[PDB]
């Protein structure tokens, strides 16, 4: 089915499916049950920044999430992405709410992928950077309830006019162009991603989270993947 590799910013602890009992960041490899998690001191109402990095030499997917004036949270996982994802993929952001809710607002998003071959001066690269989103963002594939242009931002989940996050919402945004992550002649392959988000909820228990993901180019939101499934997984296995 869809091959998913995601770094989740999980705001709601679903202890029955493996979530530690606190908001946390985790690395998901084809399963919502993170292979590795780190405690995340999430701040309701504050704008945060997440950095995701990986390279084919060290074979380690790492993520660093921070808020201004606070200590960051980090989580790493040794995994060879060549053995998990296809040659061509699509990168995106996903978010959902269930019985509980929060806004899943993205203010900016940047991604860089480089493949260096065994040739002199040969490097294939792709880099995009969104610091403001438009109502008609042709270079993005919006799925579910995701929309753009609301104050130049990307709203992954439904938000009513009065600025209230709706529940049972799921939305994803994928960059239009496929991304080449593996090439036979590459000696070094690497990608870096960064995005600033604003999670806000009128409740003491916001849910469910935001995830940066990499999937097969033809990925679609799995049916019933609202809430704890973050719009990425069809079930909790």
């Amino acid at each position: 089915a869809d091959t998913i590799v995601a770094v989740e910013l999980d705001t709601y602890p679903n202890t029955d499916i493996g979530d530690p009992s606190y908001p946390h960041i985790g690395i998901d490899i084809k399963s919502v049950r993170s292979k590795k998690t780190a405690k995340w001191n999430m701040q309701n109402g504050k704008v945060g920044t997440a950095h995701i990095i990986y390279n084919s030499v060290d074979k380690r997917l790492s993520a660093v999430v921070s808020y201004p004036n606070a200590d960051s949270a980090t989580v790493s996982y040794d995994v060879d992405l060549d053995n998990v994802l296809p040659e061509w993929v699509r990168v995106g952001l996903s978010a959902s709410t269930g019985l509980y809710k929060e806004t899943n607002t993205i203010l900016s998003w940047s991604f860089t992928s480089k493949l260096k071959s065994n040739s002199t001066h040969e490097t294939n690269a792709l880099h995009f950077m969104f610091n403001q989103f438009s109502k008609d963002q042709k270079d993005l594939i919006l799925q579910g309830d995701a929309t753009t242009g609301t104050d130049g931002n990307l709203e992954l989940t439904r938000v009513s006019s009065n600025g209230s996050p709706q529940g049972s919402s799921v939305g994803r945004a994928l960059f239009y162009a496929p991304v080449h992550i593996w090439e036979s002649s590459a000696v070094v392959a690497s990608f870096e991603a960064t995005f600033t988000f604003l999670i806000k909820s009128p409740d003491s228990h916001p849910a469910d989270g935001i995830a940066f993901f990499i999937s097969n180019i033809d990925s679609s939101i799995p049916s019933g993947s609202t809430g704890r499934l973050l719009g990425l997984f069809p079930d909790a296995n």
């Binding site: 202890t15 009992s21 228990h205």
Partner: peptide, 6 residues
Amino acid sequence: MYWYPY
């Protein structure tokens, strides 16, 4: 493991 939410 774990069970105390936040």
